[PDB]
């Protein structure tokens, strides 16, 4: 099929997204969670790892690697070390709020996917690293983790299966980089959130030096349903190799900014116009949209008139789905002063470990501040462009990558605005 949208309310995984119905154990049961789990655990890992493979699920954290293949690196005989699952609730990228709702309104789907996903990987426990600012969501999660322990759903002999499993909530201390998979692993270890190099890959040397898998909240929180409702059912949504539903955040200059769940590959215009109520001042007032959090390049109105919302449609437009966080800007915005803020954010978030992001991201920040003020020369635009190509691809982790793409996106599509401010500054101060 070629249409994608108006997802039926029967096919929505996060049936309690808005927190209207009860989130505690007595309610998550009435909505299907923890149902026939003992049947799922006894089916083995090769069946669960076959469900994730078939569904074409790709990690929702922001890199989009196939979830089934990735979780199979931990499907190996043990060498005497414990195996661990680390759910990434760091929720750090600007524009994205999806993971917040799962931990606050549907925590029993997150605890269940930790068991289901952990069983597939042969893990003994799950560490749920949540960002330190989400103190109330963490408490919700701890209250639900207690209830699933009291009822026997996790812990010793979970769901009467034979498997023993633990769920630990570890609270972060306020750093966007600890959401990086290997920085996260180091933070759980009592160190600074500095990412590691690869290899070794966490599937060999991970948390505490043990084999580890890091999964996003939204990635794990849908593993139980995919096992319950089948691989093919989740493959029925979205284009080939872009399967499933998705949590879309729409923010910025929309009428009704909101978090909604929608099918994958829905056209960006439909996503804004239906669920968000449209751009402020009309669609024609649209200037540019960041299709997935501040890391991804922006795109102008022309490319937003037909582009879909999935990992491949947005890659032909020179951007990415990222976290599927949609930030909209209308003509009254100061586009250059808005991207220059993303650089201040990446400049303020860089761990400082490796040279290109240490100096480059800060250096790009200093330059972008002058473009905003207008105090530069049109020959610096190609200089800044190049300085970004020396950050991208040379850093330990992908933050320097994500700090370079926004600058590339602005230069690609909004150069005349950069070169028209610089005129007004020269004349004004001649």
């Amino acid at each position: 099929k070629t249409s994608f949208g108006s997802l039926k309310d029967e096919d929505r995984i996060f049936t309690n997204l808005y927190g209207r119905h009860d989130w505690r154990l007595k309610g998550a049961l009435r909505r299907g969670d923890w149902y026939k789990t003992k049947e799922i655990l006894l089916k083995g890992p090769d069946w669960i790892l076959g469900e994730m493979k078939t569904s074409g699920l790709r990690g929702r954290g922001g890199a989009g690697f196939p979830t089934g293949l990735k979780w199979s690196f931990m499907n190996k005989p043990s060498d005497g070390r414990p195996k661990y699952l680390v759910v990434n609730a760091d929720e750090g990228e600007p524009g994205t709020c999806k993971d917040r709702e799962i931990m606050r309104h549907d925590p029993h789907k997150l605890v269940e996917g930790c068991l289901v996903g952990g069983r597939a990987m042969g893990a003994r426990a799950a560490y749920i690293y949540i960002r330190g600012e989400f103190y109330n969501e963490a408490s919700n999660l701890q209250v639900a983790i207690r209830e699933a322990y009291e009822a026997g759903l996790i812990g010793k002999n979970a769901c009467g299966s034979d498997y023993d499993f633990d769920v630990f909530v570890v609270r972060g201390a306020g750093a966007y980089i600890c959401g990086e998979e290997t920085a996260l692993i180091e933070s759980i270890e009592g160190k600074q959130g500095k990412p590691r190099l690869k290899p070794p890959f966490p599937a060999d040397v991970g948390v505490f030096g043990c084999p580890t898998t890091v999964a996003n909240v939204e990635t794990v929180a849908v593993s139980p349903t995919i096992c319950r409702r089948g691989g093919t059912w989740f493959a029925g949504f979205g284009r080939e190799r872009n399967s499933g539903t998705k949590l879309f955040n729409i923010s910025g200059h929309v009428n009704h900014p909101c978090t909604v769940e929608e099918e994958m590959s829905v056209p960006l215009k439909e996503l804004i116009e239906k669920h968000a109520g449209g751009v402020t001042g009309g669609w024609d007032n649209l200037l540019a949209v960041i299709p997935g959090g501040s890391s991804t390049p922006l795109i102008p109105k022309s490319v937003c008139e037909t582009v879909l919302m999935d990992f491949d449609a947005l890659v032909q437009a020179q951007t990415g789905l990222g976290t599927a966080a949609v930030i909209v800007m209308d003509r009254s915005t100061d586009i250059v002063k808005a991207i220059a803020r993303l650089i201040e954010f990446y400049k303020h978030e860089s761990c400082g470990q490796c040279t290109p992001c240490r100096e480059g991201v800060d250096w790009m920040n200093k330059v972008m501040a002058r473009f905003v003020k207008g105090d530069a020369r049109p020959a610096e635009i190609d200089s800044l462009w190049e300085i970004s190509k020396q950050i991208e691809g040379h850093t330990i982790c992908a933050l320097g990558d994500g700090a370079a793409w926004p600058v590339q996106g602005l230069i690609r599509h909004f150069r005349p605005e950069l070169e028209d401010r610089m005129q007004r500054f020269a004349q004004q101060h001649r």
Partner: protein
Amino acid sequence: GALFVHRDTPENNPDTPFDFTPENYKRIEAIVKNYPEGHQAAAVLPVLDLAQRQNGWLPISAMNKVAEVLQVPPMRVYEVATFYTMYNRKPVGKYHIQVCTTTPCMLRDSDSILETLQRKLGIKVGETTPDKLFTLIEVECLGACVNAPMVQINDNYYEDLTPKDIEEIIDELKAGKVPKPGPRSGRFCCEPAGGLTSLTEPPKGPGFGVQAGL
């Protein structure tokens, strides 16, 4: 702004008295049992956060005490406390007002929310009111972008503000009342204000759509 070198002063030195209360020692014993034996060093963050929650900031004596309890080099605790922004190494007010200014909030007049808090409290970002009651600073995306603008006071979120609304929260705090966490525009969470557009039907109960043969 802030400095990552500590110089002793009469009100912050290795002899400023800090100790864990006996009911915050039973809590530490439970933090340290979350990690494999031999890797107790993984407990530095929660325990170093525990000291802050019991004192509101981290004197150099507090940090030297987490080190003694967990048996790590003190420098390894100094690295942690200086790395993460939530550890207050300089004393702060009773209420720590954090205003988000990253792009999603900036597009919704987060400056106005900031401009208002400056005049109402009579301070500037980074300062602390002479009452030692309020501390105002900007921050980065606090994860509630769809409900911008928003502030965090201590451990709560006050979303969807309008310059009028934040003023209300600064008086309930002066009056000693608790200003009720949550949005401020009628809607309760992240749903689209103006009625729902999704999840209208009642949820679909247990056993729905379950594949055959399971």
